Design a protein around this ligand. Structure first.
Ligand code: CL6
Ligand code: EST
Length: 276
C-alpha cells in the first residue's frame, strides 16, 4: 500500500545499505589492540566514571580457527582504563566510513549542498553508527557480533541504567525489519536542525518524507496488535538516540581533552581542528 515514490525510496535506501554496510566486517583490518590541580583533576573522576560505565571484553576468531580473548582491567587509578580506546577509535572510524559512503550514495543526500552534507554527517554519524550496531547486537548474550570480532558486556539491572545500552536492548526488542532500520538511518541523517545546516526547509521536507514512508511501511506490513503504535515507538527511540548522541559526544570530548585518541576522521566529525 506504498506509493511508487515510497517503494523507490525504500529500494534506494536498501541499495545504499547493501553496498556500504560490511555486515561481516571482512574489510575491517589493521586495527590496534590493547598492549600485551582541581579543575584539571575533577575531569579525571568524570572520565573514570565515563570509561567504566559499560565495559566490554573482546574476542578475535581467526580465519584458521584460533581465538584470542581480551579481558579488560579494573580501574586501579592509572592509565589502564584507556587500553581499549585505540581499538574503539579504529572500529568507530571504520563504521563512520561506511556511514559516509551510505549518505553520499543516497540521491536525496547527494543533491544537497556540500556544506549541508558535511553538517548532516557531523550531526548524525554517531546515531547511524549505533543504528547499524544494533542489527548485530545479540540481546541474549549481550554481545555485538562483528564478524571475526565480538564485544561482550562484562546483575543486568544496574547495567540497563546506561542510556546507550538501554537503547540497544529496547530497540532490539521491537524486532525491526531491514527496511525499518534503514528508514531510521534516513530520518536521523536528514535531521534539519543539526549545527550548521542551511537548507533547513529542504532537509525538513525530506525527513518528514522518510517518516511518512516508514509510517506507511508499518501500516502495510504489520497488522499485528503487537505492532500498534510501532511507528510512534520508533520515532520516540530516534529522539532518545539523538539525546544519547549528545551525551556521548560530551563524554568523548572529555576523554579526548585528557587522553587524546580520536582518529583524524573522528576529529573531523567532532569539530576538533588540530591546534590547541
Ligand atoms: Cl556501541 C558499541 C559497539 C560495540 C562495542 C562497544 C560499543 C560501545 C561504543 C559506544 C560509542 C561508540 C563506540 C562504541 C558502547 C556500547 C554500549 C554502551 C556503551 C558503549 N563501547 C565503547 C566502549 N565500550 C563500549
Ligand atoms: C562509550 C564512551 C563514550 C563514547 C566514546 C566514543 C564516542 C564516539 C566514538 O566514535 C568512539 C568512542 C569510543 C569511546 C567511547 C567511550 C568509552 C566509555 C564511554 O561511556
Amino acid at each position: 500500500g506504498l506509493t511508487e515514490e515510497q517503494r523507490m525510496m525504500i529500494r534506494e535506501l536498501m541499495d545504499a545499505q547493501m553496498k556500504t554496510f560490511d555486515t561481516t566486517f571482512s574489510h575491517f583490518k589493521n586495527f590496534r589492540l590493547p598492549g600485551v590541580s582541581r579543575e584539571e583533576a575533577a575531569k579525571w573522576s568524570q572520565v573514570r566514571k565515563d570509561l567504566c560505565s559499560l565495559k566490554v571484553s573482546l574476542q578475535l576468531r581467526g580465519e584458521d580457527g584460533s581465538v584470542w580473548n581480551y579481558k579488560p582491567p579494573a580501574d586501579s587509578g592509572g592509565k589502564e582504563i584507556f587500553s581499549l580506546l585505540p581499538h574503539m577509535a579504529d572500529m568507530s572510524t571504520y563504521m563512520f566510513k561506511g556511514i559516509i559512503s551510505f549518505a553520499k550514495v543516497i540521491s536525496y543526500f547527494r543533491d544537497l549542498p556540500i556544506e549541508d552534507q558535511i553538517s548532516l554527517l557531523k550531526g548524525a554519524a554517531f546515531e547511524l553508527c549505533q543504528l547499524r550496531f544494533n542489527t548485530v547486537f545479540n540481546a541474549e548474550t549481550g554481545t555485538w557480533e562483528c564478524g571475526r570480532l565480538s564485544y561482550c558486556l562484562e546483575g543486568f539491572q544496574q547495567l540497563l541504567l546506561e542510556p546507550m545500552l538501554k537503547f540497544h536492548y529496547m530497540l532490539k526488542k521491537l524486532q525491526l525489519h531491514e527496511e525499518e532500520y534503514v528508514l531510521m538511518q534516513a530520518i536521523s541523517l536528514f535531521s534539519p536542525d543539526r549545527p550548521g545546516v542551511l537548507q533547513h526547509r529542504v532537509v525538513d521536507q525530506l525527513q518528514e518524507q522518510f517518516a511518512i514512508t516508514l509510517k506507511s511501511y508499518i501500516e502495510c506490513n504489520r497488522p499485528q496488535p503487537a505492532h500498534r503504535f510501532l511507528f510512534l515507538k520508533i520515532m520516540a527511540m530516534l529522539t532518545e538516540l539523538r539525546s544519547i548522541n549528545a551525551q556521548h559526544t560530551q563524554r568523548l570530548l572529555r576523554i579526548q581533552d585528557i587522553h587524546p585518541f580520536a582518529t583524524p576522521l573522528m576529529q573531523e566529525l567532532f569539530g576538533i581542528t588540530g591546534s590547541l
